[PDB]
Ligand SMILES: [Mg+2]
């Protein structure tokens with residue numbers, strides 16, 4: 026409750042950043058009703074630090090703004106918990122400090138973290154990604170730097186397909202696309218046991234690669250409550266995949282299984298791409314909610330933790346640069362990563378091949394994994410043609426060749442034109458005449 | 463393909479009795495302009511099969527537009543199981559019944575209010591390994607209705623150096639039973655875990671020699687890495703040595719999640735797994751219209767195997783309304799939830815850990831209401847707010863349960879017990895409202 030001790034409106038934020046020994050947190054907090062804005066901020070600082078009921082260890086409120094409901098806290102770095110084991114930081118501590126008891130405080134109506142800042146000393150203690158989309162680029166025969174677009178999907182129905190049937194759908198998508206994701210719940214269901222399903226998938230992977238001369242990728246759901254179950258799934262898929270183990274990403278449903286889930290896989294399989302699926306993140310990181318944290322904070326936390334890739338959505342871009350760059354600007358804090366690897370944006374839904382380049386231009390690169398719905402593959406020669414067309418669209422974008430010209434020499438791309446006639450004649454008027462098609 | 467996922471002719475009594483389906487009850491409201499049954503069928507589609515392979519479809523069996531009630535029946539075959547041991551996993555239960563549906567196009571908020579797990583499935587869960595009975599055993603009480611355990615948290619939350627910390631514990635143990643790490647304490651640099659646990663085990667020996675009684679400690683072993691968790695646990699039990707059975711393993715289950723908890727539950731099945739619920743308000747909150755209820759939260763914890771779980775802190779809401787069915791759901795063998803009666807087949811109880819300002823005067827009324835005193839109390843104001851200090855504070859709570867247990871009027875007991883008599887003068891306001899004119903009785 027005490028202000029005086031935990032409030033130092035007068036602290037230059039730059040001084041704080043300059044002497045990198047404070048984690049900074051920016052929230053949108055609203056005092057209950059009858060309570061004082063700065064009083065309540067002193068109190069929130071209090072409940073997130075030393076409490077009381079020594080002061081070099083206290084959480085100081087350094088900036089307030091009642092109109093905007095903006096509260097900024099400075100957390101000494103000494104508060105964060107570290108491993109007794111290897112001396113590394115933990116995300117669990119960071120959450121606990123900056124978002125535990127403070128999320129159920131009679132006194133506060135709501136409080137949601139919008140951005141956070143970690144200094145070098147602290148930031149350097151985190152695991153960070155061990156691999157990213159470069160690992161995938163190396164499998165696909167692409168350059169390690171600016172490798173481009175990875176074309177993926179989710180096999181549907183989400184649950185229902187038996188083992189042969191699942192394997193088979195994987196094979197057919199593999200004739201035109203690169204990556205396949207297990208949907209969220211696919212695991213060891215009685216009707217489609219994991220051991221069976223995966224051995225068949227493995228074989229669908231060798232069949233597809235042989236028939237196309239191209240490398241294929243699979244993202245296998247290894248989520249469980251028990252870490253040794255997580256590990257037993259991981260080791261099983263890799264061994265089954267065998268010569269193709271480098272082509273397997275390990276999917277962890279991370280929101281519903283938590284940080285240990287993500288940390289098990291990250292530390293046990295540092296050579297395989299850890300695919301962070303955001304399942305049910307939606308109850309916290311949804312604008313309808315005024316509690317917890319935002320998607321930006323969620324995703325920025327994933328880098329530090331070590332996700333190789335994380336579903337980002339489809340600003341979608343501040344997230345993207347923040348995950349990608351060695352220096353990014355977030356809502357309030359700009360951050361340096363001192364060489365910490367990138368964590369690849371994974372986008373969903375999808376547009377057609379015509380729309381594709383709009384996205385590429387906007388983002389400024391095409392260094393993402395597309396997990397597209399079958400709509401993005403809705404194409405007149407089929408979905409094989411459909412996935413090729415997306416690839417052809419990326420390629421023309423990267424060569425800086427005009428779609429229309431690439432299209433005359435690439436059948437599936439030209440056929441996407443006729444597939445979405447009103448999109449074509451809107452985005453590239455000519456087309457009809459122009460393609461003679 | 464909507465009306466494939468709806469079947470309002472299904473009778474809830476037949477679903478239960480068939481014992482092949484997981485029933486969920488939500489407060490679901492469609493986005494403006496969309497039909498209730500259609501929206502509900504959407505949600506069932508996208509929570510099971512999807513399509514956007516038909517005998518595994520989730521079915522909407524009952525709906526009530528006016529109360530924003532959606533009840534879905536999920537076949538047990540949908541749920542994932544361990545390839546290592548064939549047991550159930552909460553992660554799958556969450557992914558399916560809640561997860562994916564937490565931002566569903568034509569649905570503006572959905573909150574699960576209750577669930578029913580058939581016998582077949584419920585038996586795949588770990589369930590608690592121990593509960594308050596292992597505490598009782600250690601303390602010397604009867605393993606059946608052994609009563610109230612009085613504890614606290616060491617304040618300040620953070621900042622105490624190893625030695626000072628260990629002496630604060632020592633001091634409390636002179637009057638009470640249990641001491642718990644505050645949620646954030648671990649291995650900060652000012653108070654290394656290894657040093658502080660060495661010194662705390664020591665104050666435990668000390669305090670146990672001087673009182674001639676058994677003392678309890680809950681050590682925070684929460685971490686991101688399982689192996690770090692496992693190492694914290696092994697270090698703490700080892701260090702306590704002879705007193706290893708007196709240690710509860712504290713795991714912040716909300717922020718590290720389900721695998722943290724399962725790590726502690728299976729690596730150390732013999733020690734009481736203290737599930738502190740921190741962060742949880744974000745979703746649990748009455749205020750939030752998404753995720754799930756605290757009742758739901760609590761019920762999940764039993765199945766995962768939490769030994770005890772934090773509840774009813776209250777806050778300053780002195781209406782009333784809900785948060786009652788939680789106590790019985792957590793401890794009975796058969797309990798009634800807001801929608802479903804649940805049978806637990808002999809699966810061990812999970813003990814309520816209550817907090818806050820439970821002073822010795824309100825204690826009796828609390829117990830009369832719950833029907834028993836079988837909980838762990840992590841007192842703050844009840845202890846700390848006594849004119850004689852926390853130790854007298856602690857003794858007065860022990861005293862209050864003793865009066866209650868023996869069916870002795872509090873005033874009578876207060877007359878014979880100094881600490882209880884002085885609780886009255888500590889909380890004057892409490893005494894006016896519950897013990898009309900105690901003044902005379904006690905003599906000023
Ligand atoms: Mg999905």
Ligand SMILES: [Mg+2]
Pocket residue numbers: 126615644645
């Ligand atoms: Mg607390």
